[model samples]
Structures are given as C-alpha cells and as structure tokens.
Target: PTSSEQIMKTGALLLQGFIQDRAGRMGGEAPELALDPVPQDASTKKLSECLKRIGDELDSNMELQRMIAAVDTDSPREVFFRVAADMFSDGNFNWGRVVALFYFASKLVLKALCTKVPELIRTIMGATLDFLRERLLGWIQDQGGWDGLLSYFGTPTWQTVTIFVAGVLTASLTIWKKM
Candidate 1:
C-alpha cells in the first residue's frame, strides 16, 4: 500500500481534488474530475501534512508572489512549466521539492482554474501525473518510496497530526482559515 506508484496515484487524485474544489466554486463541471480508488498508506498522510505546510511556505515566498502578480493572466500550463523549470534546477531534485510541486499544483487550483475546469483540471492533473510517472517515479521508488518521505521530513509530531485529526470536521481551506 505504501508503494511509490500507489503514492503517486493517490497524490494525483489529491491534487485533482484541489483543482476540482476551486473549479466547482467558480461554476464549472468536469466529468474528468474522478479518482480511482487508492489503497491507504502511512506515507500518504505525510504528503497531506507536508502539503499543508507548503501553503504556509508559499505564502512567504515573496519572489514567487511577485511573479504571481505579474503572470496572473498567463495560461496555467505555461505558468506551471515555468515554475517547474525553477523548481527542478540542479541539485533541487529532492523529496521536498517533489512535495512542493504537488503543493504548488494544489495552490494553483485557486487561481488558474477559475475561468476553466472540466478538461482544464484534467490537463494539469494529467501533466503532473506524467511528470511523476516518467520522471519522479523511479527516483521515489529508489528512495524507498513513501518511506523516504519520513527520512526527509521525519515523522510529523502529534502537533501536525492533531490539526489533521481536527480536520475530520472539514479539511483544506477550512483548516487554514485561522478562525
């Protein structure tokens, strides 16, 4: 269940959900926004917990913020690939950045899919899935798949899981409302 491929599959579905949530709010419909079932994994929990922190990290990325203001009008695909270039730069191909890519894609759902969804959501999700399959999958597997996640971020303490547990009432944006 904790295999790298399964993690990628679960990750893909998770990111798709983020896009679909925003798209739904913006008045769109997407038949492609579906998730095949994935087996549960301890590592998958890390991905979600880690992604929550990615939002907080991104909020402080002033440089990315400046760029976001400038490129608010560009296509999400173009914006995504451009961001990918920077993120995949030399020596940056580590688990953390891989996790960040998903987080970035998740956050991207907020802005880029407003005027679009349906196929647009599928586009981002598929392209990201491709990257993981073609580019990141082997590496993740080589590093012990989901278990590698633990080595990089280490096991998240109860402080992290406590918030996640509290999220049983609701998740994602609601959890971060700071309300």
Candidate 2:
C-alpha cells in the first residue's frame, strides 16, 4: 500500500493532467503545448512540489487557467461523483483522495454561494417557516406550478443516492468497529 502522502501526490498529478488536457482541447492548442512537462524530478517529489510545478505553470498561463476553471466550476459536484464512480469501478479508489476531492468541490460551491448572496437578498428573509414557504411558493408559482417542482425530483438522483450509500457504509463501519 502507498503512504497517504504518496497517494495524494499521485492523485494531484492525475487531476492536474486531466485539467490540462481539457484546457488544451478547449483552447484549440496542440496537446503538447497545452501540457508542457514539469521538471523530471517532480515525479519523485511530494505533493507540494508537484502542486507548485502545476501552480507555477498555471500562473504563467492564465488563459489555460480560465479555460480549466470554467469547466472546473461547472457542476463540480457531479464531476466529483463521476470521478469517484470511475475510481471505484476501476478498483483504484482511495478514500483519502475521494475525501480531498469532495472537500475541494465543497469549497468551490461555498465560494459560488457567497458570490450569489446578493441575489438571495431579493428573497424575504425572516421570522417564520410560513413566511419563507409563502415567498418560495410565490416564486415557484412564477416559474411554474407543482409539476415544475417535480422536475427536480426522480427515483434516485446521483448525489442523493451516493450520499445515502456512503452514509450507510460509514455508519455500519463505525458501529462494527465499536463491537
């Protein structure tokens, strides 16, 4: 088994490569230019060294960053789920890396929510659930009726299913450990 640090280092390298490849495809650049190699020593270094190499490259290549960030923020939660599914299916899943990816996506989503705070101000905020529901109902009515709301539901949405399974597994493991 790899040390936690080594696992992270490998994951970081793979993630950086994924971003660079996507950026290149979007930028209409040759694959080689889109992902120029960092120093050879980076391969043997810690996660920090690998990160710095890519970070420095990204710093000098703002266009590439912009390209990657656009895709990066777009439904990142879905991307996180997709990556986890792929890893599991391939039998290469590392819980540490999965948690790290989840945390990173969460931070991104939080920052996006913070930026949208101004939009939320238009909603009446206050004392009672009734008031909030009343306002939300009005807004939902404006968008569409009860049927429109149903569009957000299904037999089992991806995140909901993932959360349920992961939650159950974690709880079971914790209880089993206590016995």
Candidate 3:
C-alpha cells in the first residue's frame, strides 16, 4: 500500500476501534483515561495551561520526550500520519470529542489559539486538506483511479474484502452513479 492509503486505512481502523471502545467493547487497549468533562474553573485551566506549556518541549523530560516522540525515524509525513491515527483512536467514535481534541491539540501546538479555534482551525484545516487531496486525487485519476483505490483495499480486514467487491462493481458500471 502507498503511504497515503496506509494513512487513510489507519485512520478508518482507529475510528472503528474507537467506536468499539466507546460502546464498552474495547477488550484490550492502551491508556484508560476517562471521558468525563474537564471543569472550566481555575484549576482545570491551570492544568491545560501547563500541558500547553509543555506541548512544545521535545527535549526536557524523558517521559514527555517519549510521549511526544514519534514512531517513524524516517519521515515527518509518517509521524504526522501516526499522530493523526492515534488521535482518532483516542477520540473514540465520539465525533464531538474527536473534533474537540483536534482543536485542543492544535491550540496546544500553536498556543493562544482563538476561542473559536475548533471551528476555525477545522475550516482552515479542511480547506487545506481538501486542496491537497484534490491534487493527489487528480494525479490518481490520470494514472487510473483504481490503482490508488486498490491500494486502500490492501489494508488487512474483512472490510477490505467488501471494498474489493464494491470497487470491481463500481469500475465496471457504465451508468452515472451517485450515493
């Protein structure tokens, strides 16, 4: 699978796991942080502030270093993809929390991010992602869309079987399609 396809599949599988976890069926997983609300009082804010302060510290404490340190020693792209995948896993299937944590992390990364950071960053980030996706997708279309699509099918799972069947059927049809 291409790097892009792997990234996409990882995101999808992480989402699936998150859904299972949210429904209390996550048999075995990583850290067990509760999903309860973080209060908006002073102490909570202080805690948030501390995390933000430490967010950019890449060389201070060993644990913090390991926590922020990425999996790939090769490319930043893989690092970003892994971080994205793990974030999806952590956010679970709670789309609301998924979105909130993205913004929270973004603000943590960019410090003093706006009050509407969630929505604004989402919009800007969406636009940026959409632009990049379109460019890559256009390239895929020129080369043969199924080559890219087939790569997604290579991800190991029963869903990949479903994708394989659906892909063959979709590519063979002559009529205009919408779904």
Candidate 4:
C-alpha cells in the first residue's frame, strides 16, 4: 500500500471522478472518459483538497481563468499537453504540479463544454488521459506515490507549487502570444 502500485491502480478513476464532479457543477456535459470505474475507493482526501484549491484559485481569479480558457479553446490538446509537458520538462516531476495539471484539465473541460465545442472536450480528454497513462503514472511510481504524498509535498509546499505553476501559466501564455 505504500508503493506507487496504489496510485497506478487508482489514479485514472480518481482523476475521472474529480474532473466529472467539477464539470457537473459548472453546468456542462461532464466528460465521460473511457477508463473503467473502480469500485469506490477512499484515499483521495488530500488529493481532492489540493485539487479544490487549484480550482478555487482559478475560479476566483477572473483574469487567469479567462486567459487560460481562451488559450485552451483555441488549441485544446496543445494547451493542455504543452503546459502539462512543461511541468515535467525540467526533470522535476512533483505531484503538486500533477494536481495543478488535472485541475487545469478540468478547467479546459468546462470551458469547452460551455463554449459549445463538444469536439474539443474529446481533444482535452484525450490529451489528459495520454499524460495520465504515459507520463504521470510511471513518475508516480518513481516518486513512490501517495499517503506517501505527505512525504513528497507538504500542505504548504503544494500551495506554493500551485501558486508557482499558476504564475508559470500566465507567463507562458504571454510568451506564447508574443512569438
């Protein structure tokens, strides 16, 4: 239970549920990802709180929210995967950025749904699961994964990570547009 095996088993289902819950609230078509639903498990407490904060921050900051939604709507997969890949690009694969990435995906999902672009929902979902399946899972294993999370990212540490990555998004958005 202390190894990444726990995360490997639970990650996608937990992620799907997390995104779907938020989509449901935002009044849009909830993303129904193709992953199999695991029989209700319960280790998601800290993860959800961490995700909740990211969502709260994005929702609270109208400027950041619209900027992200605008960029994501234009190029759904690129926006999701590019920011996502950048987090791991520096060879620093922290779980806080991973949480930031999923919350970021949830935002894209809602944006696509409310904006009337159903196709981009699929694109966003596709990129999301790709990152989940391809990169994040193995990396979780490498980090030795959650409960487990406390060792890697402390409460304040994750908050700072979320804030730091949020800044990165705005900076990256500006950089991308300038070129």
Global lDDT of each model? 0.55, 0.34, 0.31, 0.63
State the lDDT of candidate 3 residue by residue for 65-99, as single tens digits.
34333222223233333334443343232222222
Each candidate's TM vs. the true structure? Answer: 0.63, 0.24, 0.22, 0.72
Model 3 clashing residue pairs (backbone)? none
Ranking by TM-score: 4, 1, 2, 3
**lDDT (tens digit, per residue) of candidate 2 on 61-131:** 44423433444333444443443334334434233323333333323333334444322212111111222
Residue 11 local lDDT, model 1 = 64
- With a 3 Å backbone cut-off (N, CA, C), the pairs that clash in candidate 1 are none
Superior candidate under lDDT, 1 versus 2: 1
lDDT of 1: 0.55
Candidate 1's C-alpha runs over 4 A off are: 1-4, 17-43, 89-92, 155-179
lDDT of 3 at 101: 28
Q: Candidate order by lDDT, highest to lowest? A: 4, 1, 2, 3
Regions of model 2 farther than 4 Å from truth: 28-74, 82-179
TM-score of 3: 0.22
Tell me which of candidates 2 and 4 scores higher on lDDT: 4
User: Model 1, range 59-133, lDDT digits (tens) per residue?
Assistant: 555554554444453456655655555455454367656765676665555554454454555566677787777
